[PDB]
């Protein structure tokens, strides 16, 4: 998941104070993963979690991803000093505040849903919980 184009190539890192602005309720499916803490979540982590939870269900039901990696971050190589401008972009990240629902699923029974969400939550750097509509 990468944006097709951006207005600017560099951006401030921001902060993560407060509860999530919107998206704190299950709105499309029956089950969801909710963030209990705040964290940067990259697109590799999203992809790994999605593949795990989709493979467990054998391509049955539906999955909604409720977060997008809009923000970019940069870096500097080993051996360069401080200064001489900002570094080059590396990846894309989504800042997720506490209370945000980040994955929803539908179309499967209790056991399959809960086990798929448990398998997905182990790929993520944030502390999660499972909620039902």
């Amino acid at each position: 998941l990468v944006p097709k184009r951006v207005k600017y190539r560099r951006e401030f890192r921001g902060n993560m104070r407060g509860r999530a602005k919107g998206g704190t309720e299950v709105a499309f499916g029956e089950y969801g993963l909710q963030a209990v803490e705040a964290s940067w979540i990259t697109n590799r982590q999203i992809e790994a979690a999605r593949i795990a939870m989709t493979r467990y269900m054998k391509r049955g039901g539906k999955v909604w991803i409720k977060i997008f990696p809009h923000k970019s971050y940069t870096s500097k190589p080993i051996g360069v000093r401080m200064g001489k401008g900002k570094g080059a972009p590396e990846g894309w990240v989504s800042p997720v505040k506490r209370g945000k629902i980040m994955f929803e699923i539908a179309g499967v029974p209790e056991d399959v849903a809960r086990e798929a969400l448990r398998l997905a939550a182990h790929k993520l750097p944030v502390k999660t919980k499972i909620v039902k509509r």
Binding site: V80, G83, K84, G85
Partner: protein, 76 residues
């Protein structure tokens, strides 16, 4: 490594130069702006680069014309 940035312009010190309810003398500058962010009112003139100035002696009043706009006047 190079930045290719680093330029800026000198600040121009815009905004309100006198207070609401203050007594002011003729010719005093009341407000500096780009465009008519505030309009000239009674006894107030608009300069060539949009500067608002007092034309007489009196007290400054910032007022609200029709819903979306503002103006400033000077009353003896």
């Amino acid at each position: 490594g190079s930045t290719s940035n680093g330029r800026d312009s000198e600040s121009k010190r815009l905004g309100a130069k006198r207070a609401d309810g203050q007594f002011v003398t003729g010719g005093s500058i009341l407000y500096r702006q780009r465009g008519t962010k505030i309009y000239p009112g009674t006894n107030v003139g608009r300069g060539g680069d949009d500067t608002l100035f007092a034309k007489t002696d009196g007290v400054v009043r910032f007022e609200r014309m029709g819903r979306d706009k503002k103006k400033v006047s000077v009353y003896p």
